Amino acid sequence: MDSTTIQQNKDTLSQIVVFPTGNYDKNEANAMVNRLANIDGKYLNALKQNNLKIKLLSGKLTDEKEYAYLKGVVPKGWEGTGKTWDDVPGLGGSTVALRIGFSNKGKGHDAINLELHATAHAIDHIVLNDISKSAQFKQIFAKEGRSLGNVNFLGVYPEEFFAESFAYYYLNQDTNSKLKSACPQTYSFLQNLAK
């Protein structure tokens, strides 16, 4: 990815990312945008065209009016964790919402990167019309969905395997290489998806 392309992707994200009102960690918000800028520009442009917003938050997701209905609700795949949406730092699908400072694995989640995983859900649902539930991806998921760990979550829900694989592909060169070694059909699928 050349400098001009990274800059173009940051420019696209400038029309997608929404910052919280009040005090927040500006440097970490910027770092989150920079990580999102590694996503293929085709996906970012489609998010922009669909007026999908990536909402960065300084507090709990359920403190936002549009997610208050999820208070006390246990997310799909979080059964038995003892956590509810009140405790979850990122959400993706028809919208995207992300708590600043919770990007890394272990910050209330075990995704390789919070913002990439959550934004992958929106790309899957909005941009690619639920490709993770297509017959093609289900066949790939059936073979490789248990090779990235967390098999009772990633190995059970194809949309979650898609989102986490997407995060591996786009976070950095190391995670990209790990995905190719663990899940070669998934890697080739994502490679071809971006053409």
Binding site: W78, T95, F153, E164
Partner: peptide, 7 residues
Amino acid sequence: EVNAPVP
């Protein structure tokens, strides 16, 4: 649609 990260 709403989807969470990995627990």
